[PDB]
């Protein structure tokens, strides 16, 4: 299928259900449809810069919007978690981070913060000609990675060059962001990784308030060490 009802649209977009008959479908891109925020929703319904899809098209056509440091002209480009959106005319830089409720929050960041992003290592494997590379959560293939980098680790990628500046190993005591489930958007420190081979691995996370919760590993994103996040949090 190719059409999406507003009632069937993802809940986290915040979109009012009665605005119209239909909602934007995110186009193919780095992020999954159910885990992406199209630039039309971001710019019109969150930023309020545009009033309908047509001003959104005009803005994107002016090349005033950059996603991860590159200009995007697609109305339904699927911006997602840890994506940097730059508006040079307004001198504004945003990072897409889920709030406690589980919705994208339009978090303003500084230029240095915009200069880099974080990607969770989805896959580490060697391509043709024996060249190691890493595939992150946003579909970035980065060659010649540091050997210590493994799956479930997080890599700090410089947007201008697309190279790994640093990395965080996945280990107990690391600071973690929940990217799925009922605990979506919560932040906490790892306590223990409950390994079920052939099944979904579970991680226990303790918040600053000492409350503990369990979540699947696929919804886990290391963002730094306890008390020293690598990103400005909302």
């Amino acid at each position: 299928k190719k059409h999406l009802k507003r009632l069937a649209a993802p809940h986290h977009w915040l979109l009012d259900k009665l605005s119209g008959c239909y909602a934007p479908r995110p186009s193919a891109g780095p992020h999954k449809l159910r885990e992406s925020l199209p630039l039309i929703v971001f710019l019109r319904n969150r930023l309020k810069y545009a009033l309908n899809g047509r001003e959104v098209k005009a803005i994107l056509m002016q090349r005033h919007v950059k996603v991860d440091g590159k200009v995007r002209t697609d109305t339904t480009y699927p911006a997602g978690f840890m994506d940097v959106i730059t508006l040079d005319a307004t001198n504004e830089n945003f990072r897409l981070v889920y709030d406690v409720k589980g919705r994208f929050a339009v978090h303003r960041i500084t230029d240095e913060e915009a200069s880099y992003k974080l990607g969770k290592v989805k896959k580490v494997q060697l391509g043709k000609k024996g060249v190691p590379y890493v595939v992150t959560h946003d579909g970035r293939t980065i060659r010649y990675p540091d050997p210590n980098i493994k799956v479930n680790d997080t890599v700090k990628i410089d947007l201008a060059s697309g190279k790994i500046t640093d990395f965080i190993k996945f280990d107990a005591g690391k600071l973690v962001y929940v990217t799925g489930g009922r605990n979506l958007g919560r932040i906490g420190t790892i306590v223990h990784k409950e390994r079920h081979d052939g099944g979904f691995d579970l991680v226990h996370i303790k918040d600053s308030l000492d409350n503990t919760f369990v979540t699947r590993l696929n919804n886990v994103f290391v963002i730094g060490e306890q008390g020293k996040p690598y990103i400005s949090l909302p």
Partner: peptide, 16 residues
């Protein structure tokens, strides 16, 4: 078996 699926009904307010 645990579904581990987010549901909209629980999150949305039922105060009315």
């Amino acid at each position: 078996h645990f579904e581990d699926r987010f549901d909209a009904r629980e999150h949305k307010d039922r105060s009315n």
